[PDB]
Design a protein around this ligand. Structure first.
Ligand SMILES: [Fe+3]
Ligand code: NA
Length: 447
């Protein structure tokens, strides 16, 4: 993108996603059950609109907030999670929609009527992408609480078989390139070198040879681990995993049914019915297909499956090498397949929702033959989410700084995220306990 036409089309597409997410709910659904992983949908709309005012309109022009009384209430750093559920502190769906439409129009007016400097373009992209982060969170909120799929989604997926594009790819030892230049080091920091602070600054790594699966772990592969007692056999689980395994949760959360407190013995959204596995897909239970990727599993579940399988997770640097194969002084790519985004090459944009065969999208393949490095699921890596040496915070300095060390790095972009913000250098931190985000994994051979 980067051109005004692409920018403005992205702005309207994002606005329409947000509006479809809040407007297709009944009024009584706007107040969602509390869960530490969701937010109320009117609040996410107002918060993601406010970001534009803070970091584009007021930032560049000194423009006052549309409603200055809201500045601390729409702020995600100042507003405690639980307080976002107030029916009194926040406007109505109708008024928040009107607020959004006004700000989206100011955005388009400003894009058209002011110079497209690197500084402005950088902030336009950042704010639009931040709103798309909330398009993803709003989509998974529905899954967490058992609401219907969004009207734009096609959650039954690619109906679409599995093929002999499997096996490991071997990445030869060598010196590879990770990340993107620091903003101050690149005149293309608004365009070709755009990324978030955690992608920067770029560095070289001496990589030992390794072998990585060409395909995501499938339901059918994971099902064997589950059915042979994997969750009851703590030899496969790490110290953290065993603690997670012992936690007591409401296993019925999001199902429509009363609370059922218990320990987890299989992926949270799976349910065996008369010996056949099912998965909750928003407000429906669908049969679990063997060749679709296993998804919405914690880091610990992925980690224990690897131990059982005689495999390991990739580090995030092995992951990015296998996805993009960039070397210093050679031509760089941002996607496994090259540098031009085509949404048909990957499962993103809140469409198939991860129900695709793990060998699908051959045009999205990496230079080593790995399929669906981008899209389908965010992939767990072995690393704690940490700043690269030389890190500098973005103008919005909380993009990364609250999630270091406690979270894992995940890579690639999940099915509910938007393709317009994704890159192979992208890093999405997730707490390792979470079962509520669109996470999956592929494995590597032991060293
Ligand atoms: Fe936010
Ligand atoms: Na992926």
């Amino acid at each position: 993108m980067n051109d005004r036409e692409s920018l403005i089309q992205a702005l309207h597409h994002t606005r329409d996603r947000v509006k479809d997410l809040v407007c297709s709910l009944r009024e009584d659904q706007l107040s969602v059950p509390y869960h530490p992983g969701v937010n109320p949908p009117v609040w996410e709309m107002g918060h993601s609109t406010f970001f534009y005012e803070v970091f584009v309109l007021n930032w560049l022009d000194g423009t006052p907030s549309y409603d200055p009384s809201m500045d601390d209430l729409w702020d995600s750093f100042h507003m405690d999670h639980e307080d976002r559920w107030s029916k009194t502190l926040f406007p109505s769906r109708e008024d928040t929609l009107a607020y959004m439409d006004t700000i989206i129009q100011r955005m388009e007016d400003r894009i058209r009527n002011q110079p497209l400097t690197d500084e402005a373009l950088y902030l336009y992209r950042y704010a639009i992408y931040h709103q798309n982060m909330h398009v993803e969170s709003m989509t998974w909120c529905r899954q967490t609480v058992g609401y219907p799929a969004p009207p734009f989604a096609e959650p039954k997926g690619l109906t679409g078989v599995d093929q002999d594009a499997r096996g490991d790819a071997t990445i030869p030892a060598g010196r590879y390139l990770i990340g993107l230049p620091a903003n101050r080091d690149s005149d293309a920091y608004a365009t070709e070198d755009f990324g978030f602070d955690n992608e920067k600054p770029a560095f070289e790594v001496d990589m030992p040879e390794f072998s990585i699966s060409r395909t995501l772990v499938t339901n059918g592969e994971f099902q064997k681990f589950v059915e042979e007692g994997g969750y009851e056999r703590p030899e496969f689980w790490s110290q953290g995993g065993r603690k997670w395994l012992e936690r007591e949760i409401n296993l019925n959360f999001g199902s429509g049914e009363p609370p059922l407190m218990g320990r987890q013995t299989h992926p949270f959204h799976w349910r065996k019915r008369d010996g056949r596995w099912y998965e909750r897909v928003f407000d429906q239970w669908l049969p679990l297909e063997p060749g679709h990727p296993v998804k919405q599993i914690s880091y610990w579940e992925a980690e224990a499956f690897c131990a059982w399988a005689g495999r390991r997770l990739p580090s995030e640097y092995e992951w990015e090498v296998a996805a993009l194969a960039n070397k210093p002084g050679e031509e760089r790519r941002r996607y496994p397949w090259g540098n031009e985004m085509d949404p048909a090459k990957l499962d993103m944009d809140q469409r198939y929702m991860g129900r695709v065969p793990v060998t699908a999208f051959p045009a999205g393949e990496s230079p080593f033959g790995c399929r669906q490095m981008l899209g389908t699921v965010w992939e767990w890596t072995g690393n704690q989410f940490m700043p690269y040496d030389g890190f500098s915070v973005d103008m919005y300095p909380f993009m990364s700084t609250l999630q270091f060390a406690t979270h894992k790095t995940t890579k690639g972009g999940g099915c509910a995220a938007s393709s317009m913000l994704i890159r192979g250098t992208y890093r999405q931190a997730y707490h390792p306990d979470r079962c509520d985000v669109y996470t999956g994994f592929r494995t590597c051979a032991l060293s």
